């Protein structure tokens with residue numbers, strides 16, 4: 001509980017941990033749980049104590065009589081090569097609250113970008129991934145892409161059972177099941193709003209098709225909005241590979257961080273300059289003789305001017321043409337300045353930490369997806385996957401383990417401890 | 425390409441100009457291999473080439489997906505005109521053309537596209553132009569912060 | 575930009591706070607009266623402003639304090 005971080009403590013608490021642990025030599029201390037139902041390992045997992053965690057997960061005790069207390073046994077070393085045999089007793093998500101499911105599902109610590117790089121956690125995520133999660137995730141991407149192309153074709157070929165029944169029933173069933181899935185996912189408590197938006201798009205599709213079946217011709221709006229939103233939601237599934245991961249997540253960073261506040265201030269610009277210009281206008285005796293007519297007209301022209309399609313004509317039937325021209329030049333200049341300010345905000349600030357934030361968000365979303373798929377599978381298939389092996393380390397321990405080969409040329413040591421004398 | 429074009433010119437197939445002009449363009453592009461010899465030209469040519477291959481291509485893919493989705497959306501929002509040319513977003517390819525011109529800044533924003541829900545159509549169009557603007561900004565950061573180091 | 579923005583904002587906030595400080599009457603200002611009382615000397619009882627802190631680096635046998643019983 002009191003272990004904070006090396007920069008503020010010099011990490012004596014890890015030393016005292018080792019001392020007190022191997023002094024009372026047994027699993028008495030690590031096995032008890034507190035009134036929150038957590039063990040010291042699970043506890044350091046619940047909080048964000050990375051140092052204590054990195055110690056407990058990979059703790060090697062090389063003394064003979066206390067070797068059974070370790071959670072990493074170099075069992076195979078021959079030279080600069082070696083095969084550390086980590087432990088997966090309460091880390092492998094096969095318990096109520098594992099260290100891994102805690103480290104991934106605890107979003108109120110804000111340090112996981114480091115904790116999910118620890119000794120067995122990182123490679124266990126990697127192994128679960130390459131075993132089943134890559135396959136299930138790519139399958140989900142393919143199903144969603146086909147559902148999206150079917151929404152697109154249904155939208156294009158709206159009525160101005162070949163095209164109607166097949167596609168409409170398929171989108172109905174897919175949308176209803178994914179909506180129930182996302183909704184029950186909401187009921188658990190830029191990280192996980194994709195549940196919100198997926199559920200919203202699915203309900204949009206289902207409402208659109210139900211209204212199409214019903215006596216309401218206002219279904220096309222819902223349908224086309226659902227299509228544009230599903231194509232937006234493809235952003236979730238383009239988190240996968242390194243290029244698309246970085247691309248999608250920095251697009252998200254732009255969209256949410258900066259362009260939104262830029263849009264807010266620009267809409268304030270629009271409101272103010274629109275009311276000003278429409279207040280400067282004079283009614284034409286040929287009212288269409290000046291495009292800045294009603295308020296909404298002026299706002300439209302100002303929009304087009306920002307994008308570069310409006311027209312600058314000094315004869316807007318003004319009463320003070322110089323002042324009106326001044327206000328209009330002011331608006332275009334200031335929105336130009338807001339464009340420049342946005343450019344600097346996204347070209348100087350994020351560019352430093354974009355590489356790191358992209359990677360940490362990629363990693364956290366991969367952890368969440370892997371652990372979610374892990375639940376989506378039945379007990380028998382999960383036991384059929386069962387990352388890790390068996391390994392004898394004590395008189396009779398035979399606790400699960402996870403081999404990790406390694407190579408280190410720096411620290412040469414006469415090997416003294418191993419499980420197998422002969423390297424396999 | 426050049427040899428096939430000139431052979432077809434000699435042959436009895438007068439659809440050769442396509443091959444010939446495309447070959448001239450491809451050669452003027454292959455001038456890159458020779459303008460990556462001199463030092464200033466080496467740096468210039470190869471940072472152009474790294475832009476082209478690294479980033480504008482993925483930008484083009486995602487922007488093509490933008491175009492396709494927004495084109496089918498807009499063309500599914502349109503209503504037939506009884507003066508069918510009374511709305512530029514007519515057939516699909518027409519809508520894609522206008523959306524391209526909007527991205528380069530040549531299209532026309534007229535709210536009266538013979539829509540049935542003009543507010544929603546205008547919303548989708550503003551969404552497309554804003555999102556392709558955002559893709560331009562994202563591309564700009566990807567080529568102005570990352571590559572500039574190495 | 576990151577540093578200049580914060581320094582100019584901090585200057586502005588200080589100016590606004592001290593501004594408002596004067597905009598209020600004497601009675602209300604005395605009703606605010608940041609700080610508390612505290613006895614340090616034989617009879618000092620000057621104003622003071624508590625600040626809790628946490629430092630794990632420098633361990634020292636504490637020798638000086640006003641209230642031996644920590645509250």
Ligand SMILES: COc1ncnc(OC)c1C(=O)Nc1nc(C(F)(F)F)c(-c2ccnc(C(C)(C)C#N)c2)s1
Nearest residue numbers: 227228229231232234255256489490493494497551555
């Ligand atoms: C890759 O995306 C696509 N691929 C192919 N076709 C497409 O459109 C048909 C699309 C697409 O962008 N769809 C969209 N729908 C909507 C909505 F109106 F629901 F909000 C979009 C929207 C609107 C406003 N602010 C955002 C932010 C900035 C938060 C983001 N992000 C997103 S975007």
